Amino acid sequence: NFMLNQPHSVSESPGKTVTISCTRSSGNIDSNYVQWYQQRPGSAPITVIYEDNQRPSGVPDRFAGSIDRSSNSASLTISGLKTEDEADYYCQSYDARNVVFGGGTRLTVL
């Protein structure tokens, strides 16, 4: 088993870039795919990144996923922030007998 640790929240201005990171506590981050989910409270989550850095159809190119083996973390970078981007972001990966989610990062667009 392992944990995916990410900041409770982060704030940034519209038009700017923000990076939300997810650190895996044990085992190598590159051991399994990392997904990034966007959820606006009251609605189901939406996949913005799957398999570390692949954006599904219909997701703006302003979203990009990356993996950093040196820090054993995954990052979601959102450029040109739009108000609509305000939402909670959860990273997720696979362990052995479970799917583990990060605590989620509340992104506030000032």
Residues that bind a copy of itself (CB under 8 A): 35, 37, 43-47, 50-51, 54, 56-57, 90, 97-104
For a copy of itself, give the closer residue by CB, 12 or 52.
52
> Which one, 51 or 84, has the nearer CB to a copy of itself?
51
Task: Please name the residue that has the structure tokens 């979203």.
Answer: 63
Rank residues 15 and 56 by Cβ distance to a copy of itself and give the closer one: 56
* Least distance from a copy of itself to the Cβ atom of residue 85, Å: 18
For a copy of itself, which is the closer residue by CB, 14 or 41? Answer: 41
CB of 13 vs a copy of itself, minimal distance in Å = 25
- Residue 97 CB, shortest distance to a copy of itself, in Å, is 5
Task: List CB contacts of 24: < 8 A, sequence separation 6 or more.
Answer: 2, 3, 4, 72, 73, 74, 93
Q: How far apart are CA 24 and CA 52, in angstroms?
A: 13
- State in angstroms the smallest separation of the CB of 95 from a copy of itself: 8
User: Torsion angle of alpha carbons 63, 58, 87, 94, nearest 10°?
Assistant: -70
